[PDB]
Amino acid sequence: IVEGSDAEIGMSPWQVMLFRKSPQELLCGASLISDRWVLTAAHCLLYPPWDKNFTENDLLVRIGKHSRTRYERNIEKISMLEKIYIHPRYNWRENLDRDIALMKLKKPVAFSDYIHPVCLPDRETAASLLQAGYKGRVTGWGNLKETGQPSVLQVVNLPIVERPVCKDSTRIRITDNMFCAGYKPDEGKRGDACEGDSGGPFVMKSPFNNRWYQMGIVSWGEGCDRDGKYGFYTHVFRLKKWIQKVIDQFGE
Amino acid sequence: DFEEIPEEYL
Amino acid sequence: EADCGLRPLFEKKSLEDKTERELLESY
Numbered sequence: 001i002v003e004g005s006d007a008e009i010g011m012s013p014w015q016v017m018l019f020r021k022s023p024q025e026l027l028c029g030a031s032l033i034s035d036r037w038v039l040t041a042a043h044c045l046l047y048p049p050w051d052k053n054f055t056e057n058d059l060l061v062r063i064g065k066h067s068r069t070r071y072e073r074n075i076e077k078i079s080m081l082e083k084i085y086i087h088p089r090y091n092w093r094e095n096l097d098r099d100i101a102l103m104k105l106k107k108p109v110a111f112s113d114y115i116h117p118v119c120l121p122d123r124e125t126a127a128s129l130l131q132a133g134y135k136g137r138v139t140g141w142g143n144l145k146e147t148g149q150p151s152v153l154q155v156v157n158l159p160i161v162e163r164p165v166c167k168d169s170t171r172i173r174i175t176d177n178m179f180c181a182g183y184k185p186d187e188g189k190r191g192d193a194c195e196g197d198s199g200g201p202f203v204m205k206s207p208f209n210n211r212w213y214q215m216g217i218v219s220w221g222e223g224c225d226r227d228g229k230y231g232f233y234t235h236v237f238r239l240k241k242w243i244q245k246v247i248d249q250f251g252e
Numbered sequence: 253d254f255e256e257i258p259e260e261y262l
Numbered sequence: 263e264a265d266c267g268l269r270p271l272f273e274k275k276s277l278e279d280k281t282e283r284e285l286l287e288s289y
């Protein structure tokens with residue numbers, strides 16, 4: 001997270017770390033949506049241009065973490081992957097469209113003060129909050145600058161940007177399954193997700209029921225925190241039906 | 253610089 | 263989920279984190 005700050009303990013209990021066994025390293029960010037389901041970006045698992053195509057056994061999910069590199073004894077829980085499900089229409093060829101994936105854990109994770117699921121938005125929640133200017137929150141253990149690594153989970157609050165502005169900031173073709181966030185050059189404030197943060201959650205706290213909802217998944221960006229550029233996010237609600245069906249098909 | 257995690261998960 | 267989005271160390275004990283108000287002020 002570029003220009004973020006250290007997370008408070010228990011501030012993001014749904015934060016999950018996609019961790020590679022060999023060599024042991026951070027692969028991506030992710031989120032806890034139930035005791036057996038973790039949500040992340042499809043590109044974290046499958047991304048041919050970067051020679052990425054992990055199988056369940058290559059991965060480990062670390063939940064309840066705060067510190068980046070330290071094994072948090074008596075706090076974090078490390079789960080194994082039973083199955084990986086990538087959106088059947090995720091398009092890594094043209095533009096990372098429908099960049100979403102579900103990972104079912106081998107056995108249910110126990111909730112605690114540091115482990116708790118975030119909500120997925122319903123049509124109405126999405127309609128009211130997914131508006132230009134409304135701020136969401138991005139968290140992760142990714143790079144602090146485009147060109148080090150944090151000691152602790154980082155967090156930054158970023159405003160949703162008008163679609164025309166998002167489109168006019170890049171040569172990439174934006175789809176409806178994406179939204180962008182971040183400050184404009186004249187807005188003064190800054191911050192953005194960066195390498196190591198992708199797959200992570202973009203959440204918003206509904207002022208209607210005071211619950212946190214995951215509106216986006218860190219998907220792509222051109223550099224990190226560059227003036228005139230914005231972080232792009234998978235529109236979670238637009239692809240919820242796929243989520244529901246997977247969870248009600250192979251789910252538990 | 254990742255600290256060794258219980259070999260039990262590997 | 264019936265208890266989703268309510269944090270044990272915050273919402274559950276009516277404590278607010280240091281920057282959530284920034285979010286709410288933008289809505």
Ligand SMILES: CCOC(=O)CO/N=C(/c1ccccn1)C1(c2ccc3c(c2)nc(CNc2ccc(C(=N)N)cc2)n3C)CC1
Pocket residue numbers: 043047094095096172192193194195196197198218219220221222223224225230231232
């Ligand atoms: C390094 C050279 O790359 C290239 O020449 C072409 O990159 N092509 C694209 C692209 C994006 C969307 C649709 C089509 N093509 C890209 C690109 C492509 C795939 C990407 C990507 C960035 N970023 C990620 C994941 N990591 C990531 C996510 C968000 C970030 C941010 N908000 N600053 C910073 C990093 N994945 C996964 C340059 C922006």
